[PDB]
Design a protein around this ligand. Structure first.
Ligand SMILES: [Zn+2]
Lengths: 64, 51
């Protein structure tokens, strides 16, 4: 639904790299370069953003 | 002055309309076969040890 606040495997906090991730992808950067530029070294953190599906943007579209 | 049976027909013709076959080219697929999954060029390590 919404970005997890901390990575499940190592509790690294990834809940503040969602908008930065989206901004570096709009600038032309690959998902690899983008996840690198955010400080996500070990692949347990990289999967936390790489495979996130933001469904809070589709629920926030039905009437109040 | 009536109609009488005449001589038996000597043959029969059966007509049908038919078109012909073209050359065998056998063009199986636009982009054919199962194209293989493959390596992204260079790639580079995306991880390092500590120290
Ligand atoms: Zn992690």
């Amino acid at each position: 639904m919404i970005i997890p606040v901390r990575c499940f495997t190592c509790g690294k906090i990834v809940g503040n790299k969602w908008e930065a991730y989206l901004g570096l992808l709009q600038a032309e950067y690959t998902e690899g370069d983008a996840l690198d530029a955010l400080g996500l070294k070990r692949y347990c953190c990289r999967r936390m953003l790489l495979a996130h599906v933001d469904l809070i943007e589709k629920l926030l579209n039905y009437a109040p | 002055g009536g109609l009488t049976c005449a001589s038996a027909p000597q043959g029969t013709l059966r007509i049908l309309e038919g078109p012909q076959q073209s050359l065998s080219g056998s063009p199986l697929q636009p982009i054919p076969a199962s194209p293989p999954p493959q390596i992204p060029p260079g790639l580079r390590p995306r991880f390092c040890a500590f120290g």
